[PDB]
CSV table of N, CA and C in Angstrom, one decimal:
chain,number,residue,atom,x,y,z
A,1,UNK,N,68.9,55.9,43.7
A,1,UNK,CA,69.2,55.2,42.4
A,1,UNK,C,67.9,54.6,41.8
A,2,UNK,N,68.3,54.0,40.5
A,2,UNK,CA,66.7,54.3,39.4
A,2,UNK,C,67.5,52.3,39.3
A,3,UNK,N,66.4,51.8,39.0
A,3,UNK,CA,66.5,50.5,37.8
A,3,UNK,C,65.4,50.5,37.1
A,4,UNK,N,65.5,49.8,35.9
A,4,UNK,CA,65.4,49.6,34.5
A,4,UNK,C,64.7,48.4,34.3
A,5,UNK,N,63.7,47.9,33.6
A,5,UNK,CA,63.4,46.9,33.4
A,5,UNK,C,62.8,46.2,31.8
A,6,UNK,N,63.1,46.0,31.0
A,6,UNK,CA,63.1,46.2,30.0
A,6,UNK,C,62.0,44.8,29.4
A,7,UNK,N,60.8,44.4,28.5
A,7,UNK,CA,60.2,43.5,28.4
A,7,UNK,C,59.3,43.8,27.0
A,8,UNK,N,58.6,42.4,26.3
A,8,UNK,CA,58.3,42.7,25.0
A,8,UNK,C,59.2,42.7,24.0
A,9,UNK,N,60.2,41.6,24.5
A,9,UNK,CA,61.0,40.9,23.2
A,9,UNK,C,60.3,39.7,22.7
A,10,UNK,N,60.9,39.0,21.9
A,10,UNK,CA,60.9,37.8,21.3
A,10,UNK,C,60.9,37.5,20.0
A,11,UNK,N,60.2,37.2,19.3
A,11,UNK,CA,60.3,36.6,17.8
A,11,UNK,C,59.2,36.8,16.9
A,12,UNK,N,59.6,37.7,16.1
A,12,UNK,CA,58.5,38.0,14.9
A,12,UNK,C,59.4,38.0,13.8
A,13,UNK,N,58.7,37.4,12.5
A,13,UNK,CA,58.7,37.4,10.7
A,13,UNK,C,59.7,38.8,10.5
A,14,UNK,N,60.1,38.5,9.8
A,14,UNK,CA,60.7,39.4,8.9
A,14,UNK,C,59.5,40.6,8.1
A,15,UNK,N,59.4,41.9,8.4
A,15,UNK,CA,58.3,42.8,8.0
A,15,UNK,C,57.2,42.7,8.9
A,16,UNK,N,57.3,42.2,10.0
A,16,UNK,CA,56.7,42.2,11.3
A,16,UNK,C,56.6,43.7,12.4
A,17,UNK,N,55.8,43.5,13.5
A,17,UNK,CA,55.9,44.9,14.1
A,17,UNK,C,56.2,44.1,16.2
A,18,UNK,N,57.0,44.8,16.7
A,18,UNK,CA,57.1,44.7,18.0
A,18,UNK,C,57.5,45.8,18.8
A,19,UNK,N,56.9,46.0,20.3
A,19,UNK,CA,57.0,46.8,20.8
A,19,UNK,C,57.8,46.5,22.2
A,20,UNK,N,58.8,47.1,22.2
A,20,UNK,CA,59.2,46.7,23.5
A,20,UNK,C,59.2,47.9,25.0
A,21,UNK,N,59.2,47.7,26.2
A,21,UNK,CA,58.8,48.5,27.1
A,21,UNK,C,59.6,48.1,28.1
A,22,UNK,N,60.2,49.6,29.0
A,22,UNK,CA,61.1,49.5,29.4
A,22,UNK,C,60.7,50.6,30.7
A,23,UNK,N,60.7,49.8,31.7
A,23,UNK,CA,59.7,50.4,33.0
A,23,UNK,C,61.2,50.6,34.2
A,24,UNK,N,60.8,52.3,34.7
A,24,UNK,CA,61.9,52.4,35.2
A,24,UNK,C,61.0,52.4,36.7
A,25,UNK,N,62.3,52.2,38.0
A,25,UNK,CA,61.5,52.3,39.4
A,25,UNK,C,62.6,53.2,40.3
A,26,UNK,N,62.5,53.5,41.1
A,26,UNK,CA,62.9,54.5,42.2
A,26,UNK,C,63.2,55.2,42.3
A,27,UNK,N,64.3,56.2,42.2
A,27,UNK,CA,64.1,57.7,42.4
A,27,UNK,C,63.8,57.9,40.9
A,28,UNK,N,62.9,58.0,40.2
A,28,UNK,CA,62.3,58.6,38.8
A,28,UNK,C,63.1,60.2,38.7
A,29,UNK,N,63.1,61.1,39.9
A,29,UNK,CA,63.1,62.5,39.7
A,29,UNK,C,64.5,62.6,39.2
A,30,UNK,N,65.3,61.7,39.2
A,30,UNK,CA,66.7,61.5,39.2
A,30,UNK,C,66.9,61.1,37.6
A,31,UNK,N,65.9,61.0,36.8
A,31,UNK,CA,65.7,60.2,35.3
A,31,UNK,C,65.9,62.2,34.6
A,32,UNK,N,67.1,62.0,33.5
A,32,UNK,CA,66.4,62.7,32.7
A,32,UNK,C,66.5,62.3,31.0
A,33,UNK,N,67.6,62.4,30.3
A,33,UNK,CA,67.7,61.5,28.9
A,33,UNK,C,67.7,60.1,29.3
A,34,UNK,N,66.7,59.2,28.0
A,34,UNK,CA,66.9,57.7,28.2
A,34,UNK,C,67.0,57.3,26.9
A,35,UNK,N,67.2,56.3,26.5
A,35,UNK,CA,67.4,55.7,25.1
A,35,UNK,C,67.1,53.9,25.0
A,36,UNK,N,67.3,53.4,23.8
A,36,UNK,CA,67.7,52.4,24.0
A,36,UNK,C,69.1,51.7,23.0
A,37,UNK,N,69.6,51.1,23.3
A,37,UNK,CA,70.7,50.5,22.4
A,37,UNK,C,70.9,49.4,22.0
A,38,UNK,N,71.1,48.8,21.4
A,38,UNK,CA,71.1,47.1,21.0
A,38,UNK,C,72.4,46.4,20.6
A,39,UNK,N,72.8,45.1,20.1
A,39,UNK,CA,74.0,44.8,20.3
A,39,UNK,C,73.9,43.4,19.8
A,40,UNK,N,74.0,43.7,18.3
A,40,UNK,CA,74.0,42.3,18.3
A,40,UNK,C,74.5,41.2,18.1
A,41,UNK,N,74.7,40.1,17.5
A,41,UNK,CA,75.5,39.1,18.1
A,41,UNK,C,76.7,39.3,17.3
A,42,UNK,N,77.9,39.8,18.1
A,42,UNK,CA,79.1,40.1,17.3
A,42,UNK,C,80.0,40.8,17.4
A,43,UNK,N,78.5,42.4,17.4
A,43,UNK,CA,78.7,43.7,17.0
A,43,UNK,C,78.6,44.6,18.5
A,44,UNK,N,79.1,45.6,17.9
A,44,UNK,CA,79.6,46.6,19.5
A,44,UNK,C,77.8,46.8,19.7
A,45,UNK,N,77.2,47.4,20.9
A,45,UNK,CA,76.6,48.1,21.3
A,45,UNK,C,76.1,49.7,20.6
A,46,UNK,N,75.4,49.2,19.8
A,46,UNK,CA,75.3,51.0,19.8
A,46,UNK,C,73.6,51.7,20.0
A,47,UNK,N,73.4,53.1,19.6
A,47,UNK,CA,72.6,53.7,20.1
A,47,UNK,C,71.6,53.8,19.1
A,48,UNK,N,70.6,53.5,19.5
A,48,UNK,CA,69.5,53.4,18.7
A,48,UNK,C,68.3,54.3,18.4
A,49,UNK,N,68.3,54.9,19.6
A,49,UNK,CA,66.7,55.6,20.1
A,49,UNK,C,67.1,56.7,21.1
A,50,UNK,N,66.8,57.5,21.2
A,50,UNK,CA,67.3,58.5,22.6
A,50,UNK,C,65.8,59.6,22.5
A,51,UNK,N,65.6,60.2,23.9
A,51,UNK,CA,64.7,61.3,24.2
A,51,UNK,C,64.6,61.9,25.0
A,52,UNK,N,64.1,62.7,25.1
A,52,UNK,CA,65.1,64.0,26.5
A,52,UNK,C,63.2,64.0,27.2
A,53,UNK,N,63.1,64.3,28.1
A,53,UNK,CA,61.7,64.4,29.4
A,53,UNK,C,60.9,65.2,28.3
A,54,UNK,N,61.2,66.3,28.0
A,54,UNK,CA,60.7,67.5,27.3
A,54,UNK,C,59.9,66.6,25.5
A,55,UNK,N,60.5,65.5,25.2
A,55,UNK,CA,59.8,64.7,23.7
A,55,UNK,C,60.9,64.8,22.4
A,56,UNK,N,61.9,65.3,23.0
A,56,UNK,CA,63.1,65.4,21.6
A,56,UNK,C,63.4,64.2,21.5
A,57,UNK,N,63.4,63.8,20.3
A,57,UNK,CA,64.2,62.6,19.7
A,57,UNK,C,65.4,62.2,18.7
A,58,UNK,N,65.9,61.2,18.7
A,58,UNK,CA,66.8,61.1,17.8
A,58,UNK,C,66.8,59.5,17.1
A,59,UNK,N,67.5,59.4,16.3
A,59,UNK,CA,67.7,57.9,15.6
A,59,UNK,C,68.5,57.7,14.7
A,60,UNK,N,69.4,56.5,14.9
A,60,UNK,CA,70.7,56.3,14.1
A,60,UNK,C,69.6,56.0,13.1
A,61,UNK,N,70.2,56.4,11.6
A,61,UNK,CA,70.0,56.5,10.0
A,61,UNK,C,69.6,55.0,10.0
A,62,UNK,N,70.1,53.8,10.4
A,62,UNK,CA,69.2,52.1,10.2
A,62,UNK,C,68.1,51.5,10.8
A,63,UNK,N,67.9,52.5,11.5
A,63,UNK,CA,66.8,52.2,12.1
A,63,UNK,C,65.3,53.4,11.8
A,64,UNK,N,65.6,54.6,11.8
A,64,UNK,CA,64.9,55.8,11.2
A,64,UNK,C,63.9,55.5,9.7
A,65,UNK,N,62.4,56.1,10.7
A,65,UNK,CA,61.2,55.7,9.8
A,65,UNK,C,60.4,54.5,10.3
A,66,UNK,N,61.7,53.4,11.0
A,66,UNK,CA,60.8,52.2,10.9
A,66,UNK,C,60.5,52.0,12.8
A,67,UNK,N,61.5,52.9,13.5
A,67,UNK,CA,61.2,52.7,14.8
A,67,UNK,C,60.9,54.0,15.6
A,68,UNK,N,60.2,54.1,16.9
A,68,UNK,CA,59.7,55.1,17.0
A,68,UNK,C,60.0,55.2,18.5
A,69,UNK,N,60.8,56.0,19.4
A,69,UNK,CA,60.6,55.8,20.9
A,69,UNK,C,59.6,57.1,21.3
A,70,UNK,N,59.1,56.7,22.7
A,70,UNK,CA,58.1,57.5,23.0
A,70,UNK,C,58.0,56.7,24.4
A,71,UNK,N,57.7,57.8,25.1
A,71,UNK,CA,57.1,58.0,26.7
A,71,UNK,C,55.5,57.7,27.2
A,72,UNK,N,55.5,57.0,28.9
A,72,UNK,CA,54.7,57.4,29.3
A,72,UNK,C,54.9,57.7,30.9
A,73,UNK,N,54.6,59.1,31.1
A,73,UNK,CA,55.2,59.5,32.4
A,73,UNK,C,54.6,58.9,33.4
A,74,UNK,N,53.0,58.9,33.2
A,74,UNK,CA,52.1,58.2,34.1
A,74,UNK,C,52.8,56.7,34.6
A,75,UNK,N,53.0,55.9,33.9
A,75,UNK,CA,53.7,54.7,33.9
A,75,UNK,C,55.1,54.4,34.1
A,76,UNK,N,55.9,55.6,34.3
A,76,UNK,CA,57.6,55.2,34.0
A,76,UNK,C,57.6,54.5,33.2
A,77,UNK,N,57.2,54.3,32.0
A,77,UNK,CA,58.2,54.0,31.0
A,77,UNK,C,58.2,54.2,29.8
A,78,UNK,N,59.2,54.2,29.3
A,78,UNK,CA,59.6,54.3,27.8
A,78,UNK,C,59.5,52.9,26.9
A,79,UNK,N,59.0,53.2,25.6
A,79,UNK,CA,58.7,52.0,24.5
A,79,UNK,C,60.0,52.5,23.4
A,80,UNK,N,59.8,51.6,22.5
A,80,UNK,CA,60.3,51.3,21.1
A,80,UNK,C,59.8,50.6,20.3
A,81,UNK,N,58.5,51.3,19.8
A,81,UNK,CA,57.8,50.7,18.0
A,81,UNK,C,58.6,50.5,17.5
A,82,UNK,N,58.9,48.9,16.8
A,82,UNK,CA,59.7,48.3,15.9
A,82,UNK,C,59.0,48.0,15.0
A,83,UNK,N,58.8,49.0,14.2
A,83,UNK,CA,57.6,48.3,12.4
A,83,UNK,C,58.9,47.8,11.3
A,84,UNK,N,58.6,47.0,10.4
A,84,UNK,CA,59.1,46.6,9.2
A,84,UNK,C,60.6,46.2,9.7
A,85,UNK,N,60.6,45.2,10.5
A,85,UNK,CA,61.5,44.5,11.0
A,85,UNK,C,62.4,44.0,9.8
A,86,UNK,N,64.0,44.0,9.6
A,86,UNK,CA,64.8,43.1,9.0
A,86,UNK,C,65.3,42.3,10.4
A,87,UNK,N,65.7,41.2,9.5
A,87,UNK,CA,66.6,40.3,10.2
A,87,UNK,C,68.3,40.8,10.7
A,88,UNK,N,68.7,42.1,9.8
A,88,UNK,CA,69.0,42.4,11.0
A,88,UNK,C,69.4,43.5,12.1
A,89,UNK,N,67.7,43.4,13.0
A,89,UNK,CA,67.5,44.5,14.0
A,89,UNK,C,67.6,43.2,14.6
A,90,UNK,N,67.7,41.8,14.5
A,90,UNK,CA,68.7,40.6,15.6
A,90,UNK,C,69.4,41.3,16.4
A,91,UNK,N,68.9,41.2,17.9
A,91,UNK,CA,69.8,41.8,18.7
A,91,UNK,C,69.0,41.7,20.0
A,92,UNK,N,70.1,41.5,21.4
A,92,UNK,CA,69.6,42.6,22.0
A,92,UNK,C,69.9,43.8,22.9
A,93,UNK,N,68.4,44.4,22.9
A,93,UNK,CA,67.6,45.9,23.2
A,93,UNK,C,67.9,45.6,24.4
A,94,UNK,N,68.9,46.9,25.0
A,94,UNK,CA,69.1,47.3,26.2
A,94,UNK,C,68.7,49.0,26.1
A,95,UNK,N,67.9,49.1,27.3
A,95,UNK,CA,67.1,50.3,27.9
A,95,UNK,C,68.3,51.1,28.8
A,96,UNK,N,68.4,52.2,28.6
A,96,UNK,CA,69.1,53.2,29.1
A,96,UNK,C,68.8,54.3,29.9
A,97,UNK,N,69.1,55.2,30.8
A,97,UNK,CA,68.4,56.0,31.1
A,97,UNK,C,70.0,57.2,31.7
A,98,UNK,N,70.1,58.4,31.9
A,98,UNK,CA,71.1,59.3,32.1
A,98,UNK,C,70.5,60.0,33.2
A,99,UNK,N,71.9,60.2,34.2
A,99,UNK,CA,71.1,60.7,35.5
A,99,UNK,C,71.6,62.2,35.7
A,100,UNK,N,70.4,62.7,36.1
A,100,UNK,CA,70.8,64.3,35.8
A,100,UNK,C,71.9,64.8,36.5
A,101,UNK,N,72.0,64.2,37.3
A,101,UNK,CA,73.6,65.0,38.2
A,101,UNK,C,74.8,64.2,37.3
A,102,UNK,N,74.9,63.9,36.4
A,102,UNK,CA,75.8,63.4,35.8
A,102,UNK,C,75.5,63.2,34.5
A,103,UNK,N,75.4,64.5,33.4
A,103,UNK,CA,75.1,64.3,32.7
A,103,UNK,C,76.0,64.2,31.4
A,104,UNK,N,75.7,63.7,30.2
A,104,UNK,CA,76.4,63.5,29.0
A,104,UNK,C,76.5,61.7,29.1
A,105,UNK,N,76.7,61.0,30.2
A,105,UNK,CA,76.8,59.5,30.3
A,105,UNK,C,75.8,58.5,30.6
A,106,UNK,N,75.4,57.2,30.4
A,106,UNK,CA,74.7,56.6,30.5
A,106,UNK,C,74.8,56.3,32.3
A,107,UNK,N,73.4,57.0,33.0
A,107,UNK,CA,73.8,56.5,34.7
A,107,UNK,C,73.4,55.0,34.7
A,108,UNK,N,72.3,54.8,34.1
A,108,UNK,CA,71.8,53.0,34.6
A,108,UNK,C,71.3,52.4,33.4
A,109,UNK,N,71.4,51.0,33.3
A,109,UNK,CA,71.2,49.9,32.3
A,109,UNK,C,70.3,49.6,32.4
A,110,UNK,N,69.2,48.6,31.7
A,110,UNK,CA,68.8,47.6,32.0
A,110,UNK,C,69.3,46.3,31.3
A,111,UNK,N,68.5,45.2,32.0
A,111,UNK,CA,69.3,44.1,31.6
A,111,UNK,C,69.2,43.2,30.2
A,112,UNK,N,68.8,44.0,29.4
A,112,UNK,CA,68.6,44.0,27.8
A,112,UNK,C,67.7,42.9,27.9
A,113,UNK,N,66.9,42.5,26.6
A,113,UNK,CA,66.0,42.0,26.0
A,113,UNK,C,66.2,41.4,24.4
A,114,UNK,N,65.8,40.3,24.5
A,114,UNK,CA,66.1,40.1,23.0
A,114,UNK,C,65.0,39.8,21.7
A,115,UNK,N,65.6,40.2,20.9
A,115,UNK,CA,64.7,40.6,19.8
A,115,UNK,C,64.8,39.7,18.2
A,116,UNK,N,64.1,38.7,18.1
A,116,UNK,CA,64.8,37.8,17.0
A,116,UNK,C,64.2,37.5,15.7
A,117,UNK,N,64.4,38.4,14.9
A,117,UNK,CA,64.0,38.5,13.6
A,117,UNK,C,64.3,37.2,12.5
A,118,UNK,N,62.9,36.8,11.9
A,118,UNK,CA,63.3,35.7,11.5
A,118,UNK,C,63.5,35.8,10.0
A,119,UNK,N,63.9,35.0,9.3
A,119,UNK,CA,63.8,35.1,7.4
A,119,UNK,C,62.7,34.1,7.1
């Protein structure tokens, strides 16, 4: 089994830039789609960022343009460039990852991070 560690939250201005990083550990070979998702105070969970080992990406339409996920194998882990922050990407950023013998679902969490956009 893999865990998740997710870091590089906290508090920036409104039209601000943050990066958050999301370091996975043990069986790696067992990693193949990861993402991240956010949740914020209220509101369901949803999916924000996703990318397959190979560099495919995706991004829900509110976030697209302004955030960017991207890999580093060397390091296990995955980021999320948060440029031109609104107040409200308030939330938080939980790190995902899909395990290949069970694919289409989320295998492991991390234990989210919070992200607090100010006015």
């Amino acid at each position: 089994q893999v865990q998740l560690q997710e870091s590089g939250g906290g508090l920036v201005q409104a039209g601000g830039s943050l990066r958050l990083s999301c370091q996975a550990s043990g069986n790696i070979f067992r990693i193949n789609d990861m993402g991240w998702y956010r949740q914020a105070p209220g509101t369901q969970r949803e999916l924000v960022a996703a990318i397959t080992s190979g560099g495919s990406t995706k991004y829900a339409d509110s976030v697209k343009g302004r955030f960017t996920i991207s890999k580093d194998n060397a390091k296990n882990t995955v980021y999320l460039q948060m440029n031109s922050l609104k107040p409200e990407d308030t939330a938080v950023y939980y790190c995902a990852a899909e395990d290949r013998h069970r694919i289409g679902t989320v295998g492991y969490w991390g234990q989210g991070t919070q992200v607090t956009v100010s006015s």
